[PDB]
Amino acid sequence: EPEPQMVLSPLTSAAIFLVVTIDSGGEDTVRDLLSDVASLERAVGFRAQPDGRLSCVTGIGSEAWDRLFSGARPAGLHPFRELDGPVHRAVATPGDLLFHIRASRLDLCFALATEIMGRLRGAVTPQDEVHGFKYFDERDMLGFVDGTENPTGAAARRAVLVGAEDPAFAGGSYAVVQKYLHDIDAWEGLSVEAQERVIGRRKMTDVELSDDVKPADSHVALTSVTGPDGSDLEILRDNMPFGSVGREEFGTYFIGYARTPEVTETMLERMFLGTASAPHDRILDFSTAVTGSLFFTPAADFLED
Amino acid sequence: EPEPQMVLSPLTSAAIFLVVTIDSGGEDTVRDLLSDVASLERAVGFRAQPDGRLSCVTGIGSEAWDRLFSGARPAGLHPFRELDGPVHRAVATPGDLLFHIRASRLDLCFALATEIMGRLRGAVTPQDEVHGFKYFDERDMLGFVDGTENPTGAAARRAVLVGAEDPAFAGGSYAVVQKYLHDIDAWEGLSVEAQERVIGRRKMTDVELSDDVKPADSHVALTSVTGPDGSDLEILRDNMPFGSVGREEFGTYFIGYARTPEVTETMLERMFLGTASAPHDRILDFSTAVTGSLFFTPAADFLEDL
Amino acid sequence: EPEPQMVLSPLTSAAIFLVVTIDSGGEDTVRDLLSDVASLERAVGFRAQPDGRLSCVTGIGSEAWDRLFSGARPAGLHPFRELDGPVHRAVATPGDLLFHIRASRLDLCFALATEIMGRLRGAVTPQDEVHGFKYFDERDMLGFVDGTENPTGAAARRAVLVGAEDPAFAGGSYAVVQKYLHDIDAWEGLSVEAQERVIGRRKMTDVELSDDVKPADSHVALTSVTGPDGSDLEILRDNMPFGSVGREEFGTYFIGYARTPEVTETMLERMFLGTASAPHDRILDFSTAVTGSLFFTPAADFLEDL
Amino acid sequence: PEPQMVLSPLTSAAIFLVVTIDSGGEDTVRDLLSDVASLERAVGFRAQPDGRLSCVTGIGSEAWDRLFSGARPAGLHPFRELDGPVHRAVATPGDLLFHIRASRLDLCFALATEIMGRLRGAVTPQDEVHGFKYFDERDMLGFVDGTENPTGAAARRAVLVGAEDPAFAGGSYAVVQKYLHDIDAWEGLSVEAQERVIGRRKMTDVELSDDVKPADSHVALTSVTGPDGSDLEILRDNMPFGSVGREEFGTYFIGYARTPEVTETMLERMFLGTASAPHDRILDFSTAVTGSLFFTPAADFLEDL
Amino acid sequence: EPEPQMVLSPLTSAAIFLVVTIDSGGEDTVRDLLSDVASLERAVGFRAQPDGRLSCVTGIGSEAWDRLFSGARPAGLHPFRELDGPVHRAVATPGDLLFHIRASRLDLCFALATEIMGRLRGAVTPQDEVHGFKYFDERDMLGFVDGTENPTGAAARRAVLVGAEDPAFAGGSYAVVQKYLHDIDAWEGLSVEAQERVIGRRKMTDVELSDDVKPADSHVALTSVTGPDGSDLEILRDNMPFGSVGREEFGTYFIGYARTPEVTETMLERMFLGTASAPHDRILDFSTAVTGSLFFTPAADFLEDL
Amino acid sequence: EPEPQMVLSPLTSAAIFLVVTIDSGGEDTVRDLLSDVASLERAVGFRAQPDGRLSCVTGIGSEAWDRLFSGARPAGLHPFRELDGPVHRAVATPGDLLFHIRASRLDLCFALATEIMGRLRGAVTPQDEVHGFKYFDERDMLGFVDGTENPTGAAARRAVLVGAEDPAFAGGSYAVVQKYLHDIDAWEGLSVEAQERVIGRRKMTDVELSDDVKPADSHVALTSVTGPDGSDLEILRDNMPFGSVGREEFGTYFIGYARTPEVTETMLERMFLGTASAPHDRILDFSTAVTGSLFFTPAADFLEDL
Ligand code: HEM
Ligand code: HEM
Ligand code: HEM
Ligand code: HEM
Ligand SMILES: [Mg+2]
Ligand SMILES: [Mg+2]
Ligand SMILES: [O]
Ligand SMILES: [O]
Ligand SMILES: [O]
Ligand SMILES: [O]
């Protein structure tokens, strides 16, 4: 039965992330837009086929769900949980709707964003807008290849899409976003070897460091989680650089999709609160989260009504 | 011959415009950067050949010129002249240095901008930063094809590059920038036929309206100027959309290059002050200028040799 | 179990449509060719992989089916039904075989057509041959984007392929073709807003007109059908422009695939005969059908086993 | 003086349009000629840099005299019919030529539509061919077509009128012939026999060596040296065309040269033969059904009307 | 399914074939590498996505299987069988591990091969290393299109992947490799028509010769085998040219995958030993095999978990 | 101009370098081939236009020049001069003819090489054959971007092509080749920072190290040469990786073109013999030259008229 949104997108080099809150009285305007967003996606993107690769994934937060709909809630939907670690904090910030807009070119992203916000004028308040761009060798702002170990094909379907465990919402997914700002001057004072020790992979060749040399507090060490049976727990990420040279903002916009938020939240706890072997993820010594929100991205059929 | 900077670039779909002023004491840091900016362009761009098409054109304002260099000045170099029209105004805003960075993708522009501003930290103050993107059919924010009548090839070299009239600065050019914000709601209330009358060309097919029907106050009518020579006076433009949907900013970043500022300045007078037959350019009823600066972009050799 | 033909093709920018009748005595030659047409598609196409995207969909008409095969007929196969509306007429023209050839380039289409017709000469008579091309950004000759609301992925498979309702023929599809010629002079005398009222979508941006404003005799209004159960009835279309400038022929070659012809036929009745609120589809005031035929496109394994 | 785009990049699509000028049509035509470059930019600019749309406009001998007064190009005359013992090169009407080329047919067709829209009621179509590149620069006989064309400066020198006719410098002369091929007869030859007709190898496009290339091969007869020992060259941009239902398989020949004498010498050798060769063997499988000669002026000549 | 390795790869235009033997003591080094080969594939390939199309298929020979693993063997796994025909011989040459590395560019192949062999240094001995390149119309060194009749889609999965007949090893496949060197001077002395009679297809157009003219000793005739049920038995091939102009080596590296080696072995017997109708495959009069090995390529899960 | 060979090629991602010696008696065969090498470039290349970008540059050695040609010699032609440094040695190896073949794909290079060697069979002896491939981000085998500071456009024409200083040979160039093998084990034992000190540029970003930190014995410091005039002396390099993973050969094939050999030879003396402040180029601590030859690459017209 259920047609998912375009959560599993091809590689795209541009993105717009748009996070808004729904104002008092705005619920009907929002409901109308949600039922049309797929046809807007086609209107803007069809004529730019096949290279445009335009898609929009729409997500709805826990409090907004209760304002918009009655009846069943997705089983895993709750507000993003703040993490107050000994050193680093993951903040929770307001957000009722997410539009994750991706394409091969920024203009297509912007054209679709314009149409969406045009219909929502007067009903919502912008909280965050980020124009992301991938570097040409899939590198992020820290200079490392970003995306390598994402699951693909059936492994990805199994990791990201709600199934039989919550059958009313099958084909949906849960998205966590965080906007990170980096301290680039501190980062660039590390040697490459030191940087590799923070991430857990070689910088130029993107080969994973072996088990015997990878630090316990490296990013890859802490975000590798096995579940009860010893299989790996996976998420699908599509992190995007963004910034402004004039204001000295250099950032990574983190977005992670998973079939239940528990996987993403466990990775976050390991990063921010630590383990027995690690105080915290070393990447956080160069990266500060300034937003944090959780959304449910329903199956596309759910929005079509 | 001297080597010009990459004023005549291929079509590029992304740009960063950076305008800065030079702080007290900043001149030495700036001069060092100017002499390396071509090698930064190659360092960032060479590994992304041949698709990247990264280039950087560096321009220097009138006041800055005198702080940085002694000796001759380019003949046409002066501060941007405000035009206070009956209805519309072309404002002047501060700017000592211009970096016009272009490529096929934004990331390359950003990488080069990062390196340039890294070398200038503590010597300059940012005045403007715009990340521009072209729409997929060469359209601008108003929905019209933008660039069609630009000169190409030898006609472009002749229109844009200083020559024997100022031989110490041959291979340079003059750049005018203005950031425009549009009233999209007003524009979208016009019919297509009305919009065509404001521009002077057909929207869908980009065919110029004939002389017998194009209004005197259309954009194309007012920006067509013939010189005393009988010849058309031409500039080279590379206008770029930009914006922010959350702030409702929809804009066109205008940049026009010419061998002398007099050509560009004449067009601006016609648009803002009008003619015998036209109050002002109708495009300005949907577009407000919020910056305005003039720069000289020297030949590449001039910068290398510092 | 069954392998369909390439009804669900990627976007392709060239097509040849070939419609022939089977002469008396030609049946054996045709049956031989049918069993080899997949081989020929590989012979011509393989060397241009992966970019060529060459495919041939072969369709058989109602009367030809009875000449070629005995045993079961697909449940929905009949001759195209002529529609005699008060103003506009959908003609039925002869056609026994359809070859719908698509690729990313016309040379591949032509090469495969040449091989097919080479085997069939002496057994068939050509009735229609159209060379189609993609026009800009998926536009048709009326200047509108064409294909936007086609179904994709799973919804496409369900709308187009025969399943358990006719299990001997599962994996087949029904194709309806009509060649349309446009009155471009009349069309271009409309304003863009009036054209948008004929189609039901915005011209430049391809955004559907809202329920508030979309006329009931617009093309989009009349070709939207909900079935008894409230769900939409969808077809898959791959309309191609064609023309000749010196003859003033500007055309749309319509082809629509569906799992039963009744969906397509309902859409046709609405367009030509009208509804309570709409006399006929306004697009027909600028479009004349000069061919009309219906074919069954069997699963690929049906053709291989002859 | 700026030439028209006679020297085009390689393009995979073309439209050739040949028309006659009706009585009274001269003024409409002159107005169009002064706008044709503008139309080329309007249709082509939005598809840059890939589109490579160009239009070369040519004027026949009788038409020149109806449109213009004063001095005429030195070599401009009606195509000369050649009545050989076996094969004939016919002359057919044509006052104006539009040779429209691009990387896609749609651009060609859009420009042709605009041109003919302006000429409606002043001209009568004589010939319209939509050409396509066939595979790896092959023609309808299955041989690579284009290999020995001149390039760069050698091409400029072979095709552009210069100091020998200074009032018309930057112009060129175009000869067109539409050929139909008897493919059934051609395909009855072995590959080795076909190679003997053309003078090059079929699969590899290597020229046959001088000791085995026949005197009546196409390459032998179209190789001409001038009195000073240099090669006389033309620039060709032959295009396949056809209709499978009518069994029409064709080559649209177009040859540009700085004087029609070069092209005409080649044609005489092909149709009328030499001491050692009755005629070009390619003509035993190829019938000319059109023949016209045009002068393609410098671009400034057309702008200034 | 279990997840197979990338046996069914898109068309790729470069390859490296690496065949090694495992030295005494090398077993544990090899086992460690096998369990990381998929992650090396992603490390080298990810940053060149989506155009890179880098994949590595790893296979294990019969004798090596017994050294490396205890427990079940794949049912079809045995050493390549030498064929000593009346005229032509298929030699068997040593090989424990196969790395079949494919991409759209040689450098990706080479980078992955470097990482693999860097981990194996001192545990293995290289027996064969071939750098292959496709000619631009999918042609091989004899000038014929190579790969036309390969199965695709479901037919390919059914032909190449082990299923319920050996359920512990489902998702695996069997690969046979042979390096062939060609006598190009002799081949070029045949007419095209004679060459077509050797292969069984037309050279220029790649159309199969009809049954009435195709010789019984042509390559296509002898490699067509039907199974008990009258269905064709198919393999998947990805033959690659290679060579050295200075040494006058012009070669075809044959690799054929099948769900059981019996299919491939039948074809080889027909080619080298002949049949009642055919002395041997005429292609062997212009081609000499200088290597021959058989490998099992396990499902990707099998490699991960050990 | 006279017409030069394609010394200034676009970026190409494949190359074959072929060096041969002329056997005695072979001179007539070679002169015949030289006069046809341009037509063979077109025969192989034209059908792959415009993407193939196949070119062949043909170079002749000092001693071969004397055997092949009647009259005057290019002024700078002599045998490669061996350099016997205190630690490292640049060897001179035999080479009469160089074919420097480049394209976007290796098959086109191989096809042209095959045709050339076909005509030379029996008259020449191969000395070296290298199949080169570029890494995906213009990197060399040491992991550094390679080519960044090459001259471009007019500056390239002036650095590379013989002009009025030797007017009978205007439009020619001089090529130096050296095949280098690297000690990758040693190199990979250095930290990135230490590697950056050997080369003189940053590894990841390719930014040149600043003057106050760049070592005197870095590659970039030693290969930067100013002439008498204050101006920089430039060469045009097209270095290609090559190798074989089984034999542990990881190589850079150096080729440098210049309008006089003096530029290239100065750079070589600085690398191998050192300066006041540098013993030798640190890159040579990880790179061994195993060939070395010098050739004159005539204008295209010179070769055509033989
Ligand atoms: C306000 C934002 C601006 C927009 C959106 C805009 C847009 C356009 C458009 C759509 C065209 C027609 C197609 C073309 O040839 O590019 C055009 C032409 C032109 N514009 Fe603008 N323009 C702007 C500002 C300016 C300014 C400030 C100047 C001069 C100072 C200028 C000078 C020209 C010129 C010279 C032409 C070509 C006229 C000719 O046809 O010969 N534009 N512009
Ligand atoms: C009948 C249709 C024609 C066909 C199919 C055709 C085809 C070919 C082919 C395959 C070649 C060899 C490859 C190449 O260099 O382009 C060639 C060469 C040539 N053709 Fe034609 N051709 C035709 C008519 C003509 C005509 C009418 C002329 C001259 C009036 C002509 C002049 C040439 C010239 C000059 C060459 C190059 C000869 C050289 O190597 O120097 N062709 N043609
Ligand atoms: C010198 C080695 C070889 C060359 C150059 C070669 C070349 C070709 C060519 C040109 C074709 C026809 C087009 C196609 O369908 O790919 C073909 C088909 C085929 N080859 Fe080979 N081949 C070689 C060795 C082998 C070997 C050793 C086998 C089997 C063990 C084999 C099995 C096949 C099969 C199964 C076909 C398809 C037959 C069909 O039409 O059903 N090939 N080969
Ligand atoms: C092992 C052999 C070689 C390797 C791996 C190598 C590598 C490099 C690298 C990585 C660069 C910096 C990037 C660039 O501008 O291209 C470079 C620059 C350069 N190399 Fe080499 N190179 C080699 C041999 C040579 C030789 C033998 C010469 C001269 C005869 C040479 C001359 C140069 C020059 C002139 C530059 C540019 C310096 C400048 O003006 O910045 N190289 N080389
Ligand atoms: Mg016939
Ligand atoms: Mg024998
Ligand atoms: O991540
Ligand atoms: O503009
Ligand atoms: O030709
Ligand atoms: O094969």
The label of the residue with tokens 């999918």 reads E138
Residues ending a continuous segment of chain C before a break (C–N > 2.5 Å)? none
Distance separating alpha carbons of residues C127 and C23, to the nearest angstrom: 12
E119 has binding-site annotation: no
**Does residue B50 have a cis bond before it (omega within 30 degrees)?**
yes
Closest CB to C191 among B143, B193, B204: B193
Q: The tokens of D175 are what?
A: 């000869």
CB of E49 within 8 Å of any CB in chain A? yes
Alpha helix ranges (H) inside B18-163: 27-45, 62-68, 106-120, 153-160
D72 has binding-site annotation: no
| φ and ψ of B79, to 5 deg | -70, 150
Q: Are D200 and D207 in contact (CB under 8 A)?
A: yes
Distance separating alpha carbons of residues F203 and F222, to the nearest angstrom: 18
State the distance from the centre of ligand 2 to the C-alpha of D218, rounded, in angstroms: 7
The label of the residue with tokens 């392929």 reads C161
CA A40 to chain centre: 22
**Closest-CA residue to D285 (of D193, D185, D200, D217):** D185
Distance separating alpha carbons of residues B60 and C68, to the nearest angstrom: 81
Q: What is the DSSP string of B180-218?
A: EEE-HHHHHTS-HHHHHHHHSB-TTT-PBPPTTTS-TTS
Chains that touch B (3 or more CB pairs under 8 A): A, C, D, F
Q: Tell how strand C225-226 and strand C232-233 pair up.
A: antiparallel
The label of the residue with tokens 């809630």 reads A73
* Contacts for F118-123: CB closer than 8 Å, 24+ residues apart: F119/F29, F119/F32, F119/F33, F119/F36, F120/F20, F120/F26, F120/F29, F120/F30, F120/F33, F122/F23, F122/F26, F122/F29, F123/F22, F123/F23, F123/F25, F123/F26, F123/F29, F123/F30
Distance separating alpha carbons of residues F249 and F183, to the nearest angstrom: 9
Query: Which amino acid is it at A52?
Result: G
CB of B201 within 8 Å of any CB in chain D? yes
Name every residue whose Cβ is closer than 8 Å to that of residue F162 and which is 6 or more positions away in sequence.
Answer: F74, F169, F170, F171, F172, F173, F259, F260
Residue F119, number of CB atoms within 10 A of its CB: 16
- Sign of the alpha-carbon dihedral angle for E187, E192, E197, E203: positive
Q: Is D148 left (phi over 0), alpha (psi -120 to 50) or beta?
A: alpha
Distance separating alpha carbons of residues E7 and E259, to the nearest angstrom: 11
**Reduced 3-state DSSP string for F23-40:** CCCCHHHHHHHHHHHHHH
Q: How far apart are the first and last CA of chain C?
A: 18
DSSP E strand boundaries for chain D: 13-21, 54-59, 82-83, 88-89, 96-102, 123-132, 172-181, 224-225, 231-232, 235-236, 239-243, 248-257, 286-288, 292-296
Q: Do A50 and C11 touch (CB under 8 A)?
A: yes
Choose the mutation target among A1, A37, A46, A53 for the interface with C, i.e. most C CBs under 10 Å: A46
∠ Cα A14 A19 A23 (to 5°): 150
Q: Are A293 and A77 in contact (CB under 8 A)?
A: no
- D261, D267, D271, D275: CA torsion to nearest 10: 60
What are the distances in angstroms from CA A220 to CA A56, A174, A267, E304?
29, 22, 10, 18
DSSP E strand boundaries for chain F: 14-22, 55-60, 83-84, 89-90, 97-103, 124-133, 173-182, 236-237, 240-244, 249-258, 287-289, 293-297
Query: Which amino acid is it at B282?
Result: R
Name every residue whose Cβ is closer than 8 Å to that of residue B110 and which is 6 or more positions away in sequence.
Answer: A133, A241, A243, A245, B16, B131
Q: Are A256 and A24 in contact (CB under 8 A)?
A: no
Q: Are D272 and D80 in contact (CB under 8 A)?
A: no
**Closest-CA residue to B95 (of B157, B31, B17, B8):** B17
CB of F206 within 8 Å of any CB in chain B? yes
Q: The tokens of D69 are what?
A: 């007064």
Distance separating alpha carbons of residues B195 and B182, to the nearest angstrom: 14
Strand partners, F59: F98
Q: Do B39 and F10 touch (CB under 8 A)?
A: no
Query: Which amino acid is it at D298?
Result: A
Q: The tokens of B49 are what?
A: 């050949």
Distance separating alpha carbons of residues D135 and C48, to the nearest angstrom: 9
∠ Cα E289 E295 E300 (to 5°): 140
Name every residue whose Cβ is closer than 8 Å to that of residue E193 and which is 6 or more positions away in sequence.
Answer: D190, D191
Element (H, E) at B255: strand B249-258
Q: Do C246 and D130 touch (CB under 8 A)?
A: no
Q: Do C117 and D244 touch (CB under 8 A)?
A: yes
B267 lines ligand 1 (CB under 6 A): yes
Distance separating alpha carbons of residues C259 and C279, to the nearest angstrom: 28
* Contacts for D274-280: CB closer than 8 Å, 24+ residues apart: D274/D215, D274/D221, D276/D215, D276/D216, D277/D214, D277/D215, D277/D216, D277/D220, D277/D221, D278/D85, D278/D86, D278/D216, D279/D84, D279/D85, D279/D86, D279/D87, D279/D216, D280/D216, D280/D217, D280/D218, D280/D221, D280/D222
Q: Is B122 left (phi over 0), alpha (psi -120 to 50) or beta?
A: left
What are the distances in angstroms from CA B223 to CA B217, B260, C107, D136, E227?
10, 16, 45, 46, 78
Active site amino acids of C: 146
Element (H, E) at A21: strand A14-22
Q: Are F14 and F109 in contact (CB under 8 A)?
A: yes
CB of F208 within 8 Å of any CB in chain B? yes
Distance separating alpha carbons of residues E302 and E306, to the nearest angstrom: 7
Distance separating alpha carbons of residues C87 and C73, to the nearest angstrom: 35
Q: Do F3 and D152 touch (CB under 8 A)?
A: yes
Q: Are A264 and A272 in contact (CB under 8 A)?
A: no
CA D100 to chain centre: 11
D236 lines ligand 9 (CB under 6 A): yes
Q: The tokens of B265 are what?
A: 């300045």
CB of C126 within 8 Å of any CB in chain D? yes
∠ Cα E9 E11 E14 (to 5°): 100
Name every residue whose Cβ is closer than 8 Å to that of residue C251 and which is 6 or more positions away in sequence.
Answer: C130, C141, C179, C180, C181, C182, C241, C242, C243
Distance separating alpha carbons of residues E273 and C200, to the nearest angstrom: 70
E239 lines ligand 10 (CB under 6 A): yes
Distance separating alpha carbons of residues F249 and F242, to the nearest angstrom: 8
Strand partners, B249: B244
Chains B and E touch each other (3 or more Cβ pairs < 8 A)? no
Residues around ion ligand 5, judged by CB within 5 A, are: D 184
B199 lines ligand 1 (CB under 6 A): yes
